[model samples]
Target: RPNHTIYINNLNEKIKKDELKKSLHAIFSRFGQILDILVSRSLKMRGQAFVIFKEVSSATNALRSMQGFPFYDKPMRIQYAKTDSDIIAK
Candidate 1:
């Protein structure tokens, strides 16, 4: 099955991932079924997140809806996840 997910970044450092996930879960789940929400912690990654929904349509909806959305003090960067596709091409 295809992974339906969105990539989001530019998270404010002060915000807690746990808290953000709760809010993100509520927001993204509103569009459709969700499989998971994860935040990156690597120094080079800064604060980034991935919201995976059950369907491509849901990912599409969330990707569009959250693009440039203001969160905490910065606009969010949302995009369709391509990691799975990139790997599958091998």
Candidate 2:
């Protein structure tokens, strides 16, 4: 099931966590059923996030299409989530 997840980084530090979540949901939902989304504003985790989809192919397709997707005027980094996150925050 974790294979259906993708980890993304390099978000705008100035953007609020809720705003990030909202926009991300809108964009990633197009790929498939969004199981969960994790975003953070902590100093260490800023600009990093993960999106879990119902199917691995959905996440994989989105990753290929969004590799260089821009948000807040910067390109976002995206790839298969290396390790399943113990926590999936709203």
Candidate 3:
């Protein structure tokens, strides 16, 4: 099944969290309305995030278009999240 959240990893962990989120937002917002972009600074969570869109169609579009795209010198690995986000889970 498709989901509204797209999981991304291989992000540039050297960058600041705020900037990373902002950069991701700028890039993926073109596909649809972003409900949230979850980027955490924790060691286990570094270099990974979840981009939650308002619709599954938007998520699919971004995933198809942005997969393997270079960001901060790393090709983004994007996939459908296995689980729903907090907003969606609630």
Candidate 4:
């Protein structure tokens, strides 16, 4: 019963929301099961995105496969999400 959210940075400038979702689905499909995914527009022009997974194991595998992997000529960044509880506790 592990859950995780992944922060993806350095997205392609030309990438569209649909394309991003497709790319994420493609990546997550490797895990055999994917619970959910979300993509958001970054406030900056450089392009950024975020993805949340239902299981922590999937998130870890995604991070290993996706991080530093070039997509649309830009390498992606993947990391675990920080929860509000953890943040407040810190």
Candidate 5:
């Protein structure tokens, strides 16, 4: 399965997009293989971002270990992506 998205909320005041990506890379590195990553900011929203990883296993491990952990000062909210069908079909 492809790892599509991750929820990152409650970001600290000092954390920027690059910083967040670096932190995520650090965490995801422990899973052994990393194919790719994509991070983006919300335009009209508050502190939040979406991360897409290449492998499901890496994503799952990162979700289990990274969620609720302090990145800069605020805790991270990492989780699996919701299937589009569930949202769009509804």
Candidate 6:
């Protein structure tokens, strides 16, 4: 589904959560005003992240441009999330 949020996976898990969040925000903010960045520490969700943007167009641009871009030694795979972010859902 087209959304204002994007799903990114295959990130480098060796990095700390805070570092990952900060770096992702820095890299993705170029696309637009980032609403939020989510990174789960749970073992199962490691290496995955979600980025929410203020506008759908911004998310689209980020997704398109960042797909397969290498980050911290891993190629990021980006796609539109199937559902809205929790903040957006509210």
Candidate that scores best on lDDT: 3
Model 4: how far residue 47 lies from native, Å: 2.3
Write the residue-wise lDDT of candidate 4 on 1-90 in tens digits.
Answer: 223666677777677777887887887777646555556665662466556565567778888888799878888876666551232224
**How does each model score on lDDT?**
0.74, 0.82, 0.91, 0.66, 0.61, 0.89
Residue range 1-90, candidate 2, lDDT tens digits: 336679888788889989989888988888898977888899788988888887778988898898898988879888787766554432
Best-first order by lDDT: 3, 6, 2, 1, 4, 5
Cand. 3 TM to true fold: 0.95
> Model 4 reaches what TM-score against the true structure?
0.73
TM-scores of all predicted structures: 0.80, 0.87, 0.95, 0.73, 0.63, 0.95
Best model per TM-score: 3
Over 1-90, each residue of candidate 5 has an lDDT whose tens digit, in order, gives 334455667766455667766776777677645544455565644466555555566667777888898877777876665552222224
Q: Looking at model 4, which ten-residue stretch has the lowest summed lDDT?
A: 81-90
Q: Please say which candidate is ahead in TM-score: 2 or 3.
A: 3
**Model 3 per-residue lDDT tens digits across residues 2-88:** 898999998889999899999999998889999889989898999998998988899999989999999999999988999888997
- Candidate scoring better on lDDT of 1 and 2: 2
Candidate 2, lDDT over the whole model:
0.82
Q: Candidate 6 clashing pairs?
A: none
User: Which parts of model 3 have CA positions greater than 4 angstroms off?
Assistant: none
Estimate, for each residue in 1-90, the C-alpha lDDT of model 6 and write its tens digit: 789889899888888989999999988988899988999878789999989998899998897899889899899898889889888899
Report the Cα lDDT for residue 33, model 6: 95
Native-to-model Cα distance after best TM-score fit, residue 25 in candidate 4, in Å? 0.9
Q: Which has the higher lDDT value, candidate number 1 or candidate number 4?
A: 1
Clashing pairs for model 2 are none
- The best-first sequence of candidates by TM-score reads 3, 6, 2, 1, 4, 5
